[PDB]
């Protein structure tokens, strides 16, 4: 996360982190239920063996809520393509169930029509992660969050050197130096409505981080609700 702020106690409880053999994070995820994590399909080509960590806000100190979970099944969308990052979505089923507590809770899945008409028309959404704090910099030891405006679709297409498919949407700023970055991929984009948080996106890609005239591109979760429902029953 470039710019933004720290998540305070209990404010980002649906955050998950994908960790490698060295206990280093490489991607984010969103807790959907006691057995399932939402992430980006492209993150699956970044480590041979990995686990999932939840309930963590500071990677440098033991806080009391941290839990590591092993992955039982990896369900990647069969239409994912590395060429364009279309269908950049995957669900992970864990071997053991997540025990909810302070800093550990799921985000809600919304219904498609209502989410597209009411959530995605709000002024802003919220992105979070332990990713790079600068395009060429290092990953954050603190969990960060950032309010990102929804961006007009035609404006986003005009600014982009890569295709924006029906399965993507844009959020962020034109010139203000705030955006998601490397290591945040797969993490949550949520929208608040009457104090309840609904998953609206997945951190996917960008031409660098926080560059002028460029936006953050997110997987459009509302187009995959039936797909997610199928994956969570198998």
């Amino acid at each position: 996360i470039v710019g933004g702020q720290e998540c305070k106690d209990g404010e980002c409880p649906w955050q998950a982190l994908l960790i490698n053999e060295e206990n280093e994070g490489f991607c984010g995820g969103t807790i959907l239920s006691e057995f399932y994590i939402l992430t980006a399909a492209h993150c699956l080509y970044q480590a041979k063996r990995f686990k999932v960590r939840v309930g963590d806000r500071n990677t440098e100190q033991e806080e009391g809520g941290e839990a590591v979970h092993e992955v039982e099944v990896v369900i990647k969308h069969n239409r994912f393509t590395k060429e364009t990052y279309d269908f950049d979505i995957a669900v992970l089923r864990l071997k053991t169930p997540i025990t909810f507590r302070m800093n550990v809770a799921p985000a809600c899945l919304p219904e498609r029509d209502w989410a597209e008409s009411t959530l995605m028309t709000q002024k802003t959404g919220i992105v979070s992660g332990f990713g790079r704090t600068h395009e060429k910099g290092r990953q954050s030891t603190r969990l960060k969050m950032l309010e990102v405006p929804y961006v007009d679709r035609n404006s986003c297409k005009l600014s982009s050197s890569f295709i924006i498919t029906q399965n993507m949407f844009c959020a962020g700023y034109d010139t203000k130096q705030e955006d998601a970055c490397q290591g945040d991929s797969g993490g949550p984009h949520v929208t608040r409505f009457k104090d309840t948080y609904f998953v609206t996106g997945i951190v996917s890609w960008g031409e660098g981080c926080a560059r002028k005239g460029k936006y953050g591109i997110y997987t459009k979760v509302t187009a995959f609700l039936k797909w997610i429902d199928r994956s969570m029953k198998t």
Binding site: P13, A105, L109, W114, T196, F198
Partner: protein, 52 residues
Amino acid sequence: KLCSLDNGDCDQFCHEEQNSVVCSCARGYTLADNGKACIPTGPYPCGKQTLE
């Protein structure tokens, strides 16, 4: 009108069916007697920041 007017007075999901507003809730909640509010069925319901 209907769902376009303050979410139809619904806590969460709003749908327009025939001539009237119909409210519903996310998995893990049930609709209250008033047909508008959403009640969590158990501890740590989806979408709520944690206090305890």
